[PDB]
Amino acid sequence: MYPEEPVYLPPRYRGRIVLTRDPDGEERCVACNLCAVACPVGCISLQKAETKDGRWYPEFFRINFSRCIFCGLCEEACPTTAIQLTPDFEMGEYKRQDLVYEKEDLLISGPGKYPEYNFYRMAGMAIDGKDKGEAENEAKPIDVKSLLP
Amino acid sequence: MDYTLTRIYPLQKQEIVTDPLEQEVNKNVFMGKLNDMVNWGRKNSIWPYNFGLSCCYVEMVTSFTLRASPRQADLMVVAGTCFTKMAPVIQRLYDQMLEPKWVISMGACANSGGMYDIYSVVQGVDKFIPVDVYIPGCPPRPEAYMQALMLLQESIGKERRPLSWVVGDQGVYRANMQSERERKRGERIAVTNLRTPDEI
Amino acid sequence: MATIHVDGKEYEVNGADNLLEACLSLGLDIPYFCWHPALGSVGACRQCAVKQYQNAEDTRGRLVMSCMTPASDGTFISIDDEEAKQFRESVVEWLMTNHPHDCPVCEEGGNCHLQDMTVMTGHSFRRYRFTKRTHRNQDLGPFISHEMNRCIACYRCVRYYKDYADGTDLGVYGAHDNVYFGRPEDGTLESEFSGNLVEICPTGVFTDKTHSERYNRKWDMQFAPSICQQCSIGCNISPGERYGELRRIENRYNGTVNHYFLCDRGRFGYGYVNLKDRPRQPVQRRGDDFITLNAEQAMQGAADILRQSKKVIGIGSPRASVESNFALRELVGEENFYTGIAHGEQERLQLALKVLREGGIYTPALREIESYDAVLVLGEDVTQTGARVALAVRQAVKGKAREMAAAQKVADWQIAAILNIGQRAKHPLFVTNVDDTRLDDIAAWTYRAPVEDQARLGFAIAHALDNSAPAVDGIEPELQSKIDVIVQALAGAKKPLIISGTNAGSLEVIQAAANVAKALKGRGADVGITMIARSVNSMGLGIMGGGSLEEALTELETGRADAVVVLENDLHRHASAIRVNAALAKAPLVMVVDHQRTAIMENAHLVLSAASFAESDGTVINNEGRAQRFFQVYDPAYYDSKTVMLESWRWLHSLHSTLLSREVDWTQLDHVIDAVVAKIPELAGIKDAAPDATFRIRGQKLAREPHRYSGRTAMRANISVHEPRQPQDIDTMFTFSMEGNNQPTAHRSQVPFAWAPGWNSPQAWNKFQDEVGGKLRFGDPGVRLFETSENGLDYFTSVPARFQPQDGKWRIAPYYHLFGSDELSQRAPVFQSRMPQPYIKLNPADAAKLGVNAGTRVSFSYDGNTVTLPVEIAEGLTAGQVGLPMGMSGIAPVLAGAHLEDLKEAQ
Amino acid sequence: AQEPAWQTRDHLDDPVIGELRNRFGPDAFTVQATRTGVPVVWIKREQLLEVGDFLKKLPKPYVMLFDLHGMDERLRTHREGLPAADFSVFYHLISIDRNRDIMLKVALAENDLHVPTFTKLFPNANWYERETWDLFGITFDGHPNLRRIMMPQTWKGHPLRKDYPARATEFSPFELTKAKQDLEMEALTFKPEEWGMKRGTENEDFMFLNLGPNHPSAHGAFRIVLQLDGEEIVDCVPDIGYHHRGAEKMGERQSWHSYIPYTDRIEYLGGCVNEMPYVLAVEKLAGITVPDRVNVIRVMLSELFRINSHLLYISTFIQDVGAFFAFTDRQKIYDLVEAITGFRMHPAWFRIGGVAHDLPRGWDRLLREFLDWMPKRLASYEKAALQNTILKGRSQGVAAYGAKEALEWGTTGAGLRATGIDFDVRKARPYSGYENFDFEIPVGGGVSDCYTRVMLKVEELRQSLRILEQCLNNMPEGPFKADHPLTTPPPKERTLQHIETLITHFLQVSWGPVMPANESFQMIEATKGINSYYLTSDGSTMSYRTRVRTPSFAHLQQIPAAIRGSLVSDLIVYLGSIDFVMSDVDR
Ligand code: SF4
Ligand code: SF4
Ligand code: SF4
Ligand code: SF4
Ligand code: SF4
Ligand code: SF4
Ligand code: FES
Ligand SMILES: [Ca+2]
Ligand SMILES: [Cl-]
């Protein structure tokens, strides 16, 4: 039995929330604040920041698991599959202040439940690696000074 | 290991101190053996009093699969929302318990009010009752309570409570244990791939 | 006026309006993009499609554009017709075919009109499977960012920037689906009103870079109705905060003042509030030791020294509120209260007030200026001092086309036709300055001359309009010919407008303008007079009155005064730094109450941490004499509990109480307002500027946060997992939370922000107005303190003599910069690039005489100080005059009219 | 009919409208068109008792007051065609004989919030009127004892008023201290009249039966003030409100989508059964007709939770009254629910337009295994009850009531059916494609005693297993989310790759889904009785009013009339026979 015998949790189990990374190793988070507004308890706080290339990312990401109800509304709200509820249930603590997780306690080293999705390969905003016209279903920029009619 | 001294709730003496036993002036191998024996008996004999509130009590009874009197209980598990009309009752039951006593907050509601930041709910039992272990969840899985009990056992095995109420220092020295979040940060961050949410 | 039938229901609308404007004003929802309440109707996006029937028996009508269709009587239209709904959804689908998938990473998300219309049209399924067009972006300067991929070709930016603001650097390039909207080349947008593009563009092509650095979504912003504090126009703004920092300033619709447009100084010049060198707690200087005190300790200790002080004088500021200045006046006594302004500046400000309060001529509101048929600007570089007045003057000049079009019975909303009928025809405009002005493009004539000569022109125009007016001697025949054109233009005008101000640095230019306006009034004309001041509460300090900074310094210099309480004034912009520093060093006690770190603070014994407009509530009076109230946006101590930044009136009121009772009294704002109305009868309207703190909407306080504000239980979790108590507000009717009311139909006039279900973009103001493009449904906020007097002032008979160059002396000519002249805006970091590099301007001939060329550094002495500046050649500047950037750190605005002496090539 | 069910209707065709018009006159009432599905009539306050009596005395008459509550209309902007009112009180009446309901609405002015009591016509109105007074401040003139029922008697202000702050105030130790003292001095400062009770032959002992951790059966913790004559109950007053979490006030602080988590927490043992009535009502406001696969998925999850709740209820009753291990059987259900929802007690899976995800691959295997395990386990459950003479002896003829008592107290579910009234919403008013399933409604023989109630719940398990078998063998193939512009959130695969769907998602998960101004109502057969959601939209992204009628609240008001004259032992058996949770009672 527990804890000697582990418990099978189904792949969709709504437990510890983690931030994930894209197949390229970059954080999938773009700091759009959709998961936070969609959150019914208001236990998510983050601030947008931008790399010199122009990539948006969370300067800070805070989740108060003392208030979290593990509903998965935030994971259902990402347009980037960064925030994901993972099959984990052991998060007991001694002080409530330690139930406030930061990006250091949330950003893992892999893609998580969604294995191959990069919003930056769909976005039209240019970043280091993807220039204008290099996204999916995207034509190359045509200059207004082009000679072709 | 640093300790927090609660000499003689929201406001009370909480001086960070050093292991009182390690201090040479009050260092006795016999006294240390005695402290360990008492801590061992207490951590291996935690009789519980489950105050049933809201939906968390239902998960608790699944884990159960009784000190009906608060007097015979060593641990009060607050499992449910701390409603305004229920708060006086919770305080009275906890105040009808004897030393040593421990409190485990089970559920987002008991932890901080959870999704119920409303006019009829106290935002956390830690607003009126001292808590030792917090269990995040809504409802927390039955197995999560078992982890919390094991965490309490560890904290109890490190306490330095008075060995007798007539002699010695009557101060409750609780160890400043390492946060479980930092303790298991390495394994959690190392996680790379997970099962796709497509299969049972 | 006309009866229309929309979807069966009958409605009474103005026949002079278009169906879009009419139906939107009826509360009916029709999607749109190309049409703007201020830019008129063009009919490009074809989104406002509505089915129109010829009669009540017509069952097969036609799809028409509501924006390009008159709201004529007997009009039968249907917005819910299936074909209309299908076409309106198809228009959105066509716009979505080449639209980038960048919602999460665009700064318009949650405030995007395109997102709102996609949902309103009910288009959630994509059928297009081909490629999406891409465009490379451009650099547009330090304030506006470019993302052409998100464009929908509605043409709003080019119509506003070029047809409304008269800019010349934005345009439409390319053809078919490769249409591009931007500058002809990478560079900074040159229009002083380029910022309005961020709200005009219905997508995210133009965005605010000042916010992008610390970007947050609209639902997470705490907003408060505030008045802009960067100049004297008094535009209504909606400052927004997140995590304890002012994030962005948005336009607050005031159908009487700024309506839908702000200027760059007010929209991007707020970073000074987020400076990390600002005072946050009261600090006392003991020798070389600085001790952080608490409010209670600061009050007790200060009152102890003040109680044993022989004479305590107080210096106010045009930046401070009416309540804050009044609190200092009561603390030190009216006899010991001094306006922190130079004698000359006060004389000019009081003369301007006397003209507006006792001249018998109406002073127009910002929006009313767009209805005059002739404008004369005497000495005021409005574009650089009151930019929004320059935008209004531009719309007034465009009246000739509107009049010409009305004669051909063309609808007022058909802008394209009005522009074609008009061509280059414009209403007469004449501007006078020491050199070139930005309004020279639309001006019939620009008189570049010394301030004295500019005034002589005014007296001359007055004499020509009325011989009873003092005559001027020495006008050359050439100038007289030019004067006659102005006289005939003003004489022929049905609604003339005379605009002057205190920025010229001449009392005569204000007197000349008064004479011209009096002359036109005598000839029975609807003349208007406008006076541009210098700061947010210059007129308010002028009405209150007090001694000059010079007189205050003399008190401290004779030693008669031992204690000086300075209020939000650096003192170096109104007087010599050498004099101020020396005078402040002879005072046993020097207390400074400011929200910014100034130089005088270095030698202050005590510095009280005052709050800025964002963290304070008060009343300011604009150039037109309208008292407007600003409200606190956020609590400064919410995140950092140690912060003790209190309103200046609260600090001073508590000190006065501790001085008289040894007890602290942090009163409510309403009490201070009641004190001002009782003591000063002139400042009595300030009571009606806004409702008190007991005002409620059906029992609910007004809200500052949107209903979807997020992070409530996590924003301060780092400091304490225990959520803090909602900051409470006893001064205003606004709650520092979302538990309040922001309904578009709430019987109020103070709107913190505009949001309506389905309308998350700035287009939501439409639901808060009586008629789209009109006024707030229950009146626009603000009260004019004075009405037009029954009698006027006598003509000023003091005509100055012509300017004469004097070897050695160099008259300092006043050059103002929208970016640099204001004190607080210059402190903002994003303004460093836009602000001009230091310079001195010289007449080409004078430069040749001094044997110096462009770039040559020249040394000159003012207050016993040699200064070096690079030489710039200004042909328009008359000889004997030197040009200096007024307000730029070092060049105090007072230098205007002074003279430089040893001007020579440096080294 | 070709016209969709969500279509706004005035129901003037309803015969009751003609009857009222020919009795009180055409200018005595205003008919409001809504998406509630019931004729809504605005009657004057001086005719409320007259109209009520007429409806009670009609061929096939209205015999049950389903719901009575208030509404603050001081901030409602879309009130076109509604009589002027600052506050209002609604009366939902059900006529089982004509299978039709009517909503009588009375307009009130802020200055005079007084309405004649309706307790004389329908006795169940006592608690509803007390709650309306507690949360709105509307006084019912003639009420026997109008005291607060959900909030402390010392509470200042009416919580459900719009001007009332919704979030929690700063904790005050002092108030807890005083509250604790008042509790310790309650016995000394007890007055029977304050509880509506009267001293009689004297020497009668007033007592407080605490039913919390002393007797905990997952029913919650409340207390009943018992007036005894030895061991016989002369009168009892259940004290409730100890589990009030302001769920209806939260509906006005949460978007239509962000409130779903809260629905599952009204009746925790029901899970998805609690979100069915809410999603269906919001879908009527949105005008969404859900696809057949969603209908079958939403039935399957509901019946899984219906079995889970019954198992626990039957197990607990049998354990206490008689001498059926729910744990094992309940875990197997939780495992399937966890595999599909990712959660056990509070799935929050149902969405406005469908379900959050599609059925996980392998769901069929798990369901088949459970449908091959329960058959035998159920056989054991009934055998016990059928042959447990101890149970039969201690349960039969205890807290017995007939059809009249069930109708006058709003009793629904097994209690109503035990009295012989065959009224199951799943059959009477089919919803979620239940009409496409072959199942029978267990009905009693005229007497609702503790035994008959439990036996019906056992027979319901068998019928639920039948529906679950049809769901497993006839699961339709197609969309798990409706193809409607207001489906929230939109299909994720398209959101991740299409701008139009990304835009729709962004706004629906941020500001919220905009529901046009209207009033909807959906009643469903829950695990403990008829649960309904009366939703009012003012055209925004949040509800203007979320009324949740819960069966447990009415079942606890009938206790005094059904247990009077019995012994405390009988009361404890009755409390068990009533499948109830205090979360459903207090909301
Ligand atoms: S976790 Fe997802 S939803 Fe939240 S801010 Fe990052 S990208 Fe946006
Ligand atoms: S799981 Fe639910 S409560 Fe937790 S952060 Fe996500 S949305 Fe908020
Ligand atoms: S934390 Fe969640 S599951 Fe536990 S009692 Fe509160 S609402 Fe119920
Ligand atoms: S402009 Fe609007 S619709 Fe386009 S990406 Fe930005 S937020 Fe989305
Ligand atoms: S840049 Fe903006 S205003 Fe200009 S055409 Fe594109 S969407 Fe319209
Ligand atoms: S014109 Fe003056 S008041 Fe208006 S926005 Fe510009 S600086 Fe501010
Ligand atoms: S808004 Fe009418 S055509 Fe564009
Ligand atoms: Ca204030
Ligand atoms: Cl001249």
From Swiss-Prot, chain A:
[4Fe-4S] cluster 1 binds at C29, C32, C35, C78. It is found in: Cell inner membrane. One of its GO terms (molecular function) is iron ion binding. Its EC number is 7.1.1.-. It catalyses: a quinone + NADH + 5 H(+)(in) = a quinol + NAD(+) + 4 H(+)(out). Keywords: 4Fe-4S, Cell inner membrane, Cell membrane, Iron, Iron-sulfur, Membrane, Metal-binding, NAD, Quinone, Repeat, Translocase, Ubiquinone. The keyword Signal does not apply. Binds 2 [4Fe-4S] clusters per subunit. Residues 19-49, 59-88 form the 4Fe-4S ferredoxin-type domain. One of its GO terms (biological process) is respiratory electron transport chain. [4Fe-4S] cluster 2 binds at C39, C68, C71, C74. The keyword Endoplasmic reticulum does not apply. It is a peripheral membrane protein. One of its GO terms (cellular component) is respiratory chain complex I. Its cofactor is [4Fe-4S] cluster. NDH-1 shuttles electrons from NADH, via FMN and iron-sulfur (Fe-S) centers, to quinones in the respiratory chain. The immediate electron acceptor for the enzyme in this species is believed to be ubiquinone. Couples the redox reaction to proton translocation (for every two electrons transferred, four hydrogen ions are translocated across the cytoplasmic membrane), and thus conserves the redox energy in a proton gradient. NDH-1 is composed of 13 different subunits. Subunits NuoA, H, J, K, L, M, N constitute the membrane sector of the complex. Belongs to the complex I 23 kDa subunit family. This is NADH-quinone oxidoreductase subunit I. It comes from Escherichia coli (strain K12). The gene is nuoI. The chain holds residues 32 to 180 of 180 of the full protein.
Curated annotation (Swiss-Prot), chain B:
Transmembrane segments: none annotated. The keyword Iron applies. It comes from the Bacteria. Its cofactor is [4Fe-4S] cluster. It catalyses: a quinone + NADH + 5 H(+)(in) = a quinol + NAD(+) + 4 H(+)(out). This is NADH-quinone oxidoreductase subunit B. [4Fe-4S] cluster binds at C55, C56, C109, C138. It comes from Escherichia coli (strain K12). Its EC number is 7.1.1.-. GO terms for molecular function: 4 iron, 4 sulfur cluster binding; iron ion binding; NADH dehydrogenase (ubiquinone) activity; NADH:ubiquinone reductase (non-electrogenic) activity; quinone binding.
Curated annotation (Swiss-Prot), chain C:
Its cofactor is [2Fe-2S] cluster; [4Fe-4S] cluster. It catalyses: a quinone + NADH + 5 H(+)(in) = a quinol + NAD(+) + 4 H(+)(out). Its main location: cytoplasm. It is a peripheral membrane protein. Its EC number is 7.1.1.-. Binds 1 [2Fe-2S] cluster per subunit. [2Fe-2S] cluster binds at C34, C45, C48, C67. [4Fe-4S] cluster 1 binds at H99, C103, C106, C112. Keywords: 2Fe-2S, 4Fe-4S, Cell inner membrane, Cell membrane, Cytoplasm, Iron, Iron-sulfur, Membrane, Metal-binding, NAD, Quinone, Translocase, Ubiquinone. InterPro entries: 2Fe-2S_ferredoxin-like_sf (IPR036010), 2Fe-2S_ferredoxin-type (IPR001041), Asp_de-COase-like_dom_sf (IPR009010), MoPterin_dinucl-bd_dom (IPR006657), Mopterin_OxRdtase (IPR006656), Mopterin_OxRdtase_4Fe-4S_dom (IPR006963), NADH_UbQ_OxRdtase_75kDa_su_CS (IPR000283), NADH_UbQ_OxRdtase_ferredoxin (IPR054351). Belongs to the complex I 75 kDa subunit family. Composed of 13 different subunits. Subunits NuoCD, E, F, and G constitute the peripheral sector of the complex. This is NADH-quinone oxidoreductase subunit G. It comes from Escherichia coli (strain K12).
UniProtKB/Swiss-Prot annotation, chain D:
PROSITE patterns: COMPLEX1_30K, COMPLEX1_49K. SUPFAM superfamilies: HydB/Nqo4-like (SSF56762), Nqo5-like (SSF143243). The lineage of its organism: Bacteria, Pseudomonadati, Pseudomonadota, Gammaproteobacteria, Enterobacterales. One of its GO terms (cellular component) is NADH dehydrogenase complex. It comes from Escherichia coli (strain K12). This is NADH-quinone oxidoreductase subunit C/D. One of its GO terms (biological process) is respiratory electron transport chain. Its EC number is 7.1.1.-. GO terms for molecular function: NAD binding; NADH dehydrogenase (ubiquinone) activity; NADH:ubiquinone reductase (non-electrogenic) activity; quinone binding. The gene is nuoC. In the N-terminal section; belongs to the complex I 30 kDa subunit family. Keywords: Cell inner membrane, Cell membrane, Cytoplasm, Membrane, Multifunctional enzyme, NAD, Quinone, Translocase, Transport, Ubiquinone. PANTHER family: NADH-QUINONE OXIDOREDUCTASE SUBUNIT C_D, NADH-UBIQUINONE OXIDOREDUCTASE 49 KDA SUBUNIT. The keyword Transport applies. InterPro entries: NADH_DH_suC, NADH_DH_suCD, NADH_Q_OxRdtase_suD, NADH_quin_OxRdtase_su_C/D-like, NADH_UbQ_OxRdtase_30kDa_su, NADH_UbQ_OxRdtase_49kDa_CS, NADH_UbQ_OxRdtase_CS, NDH1_su_D/H. It is a peripheral membrane protein. Residues 1-181 are annotated as: NADH dehydrogenase I subunit C. NDH-1 is composed of 13 different subunits. Subunits NuoB, CD, E, F, and G constitute the peripheral sector of the complex. The keyword Repressor does not apply.
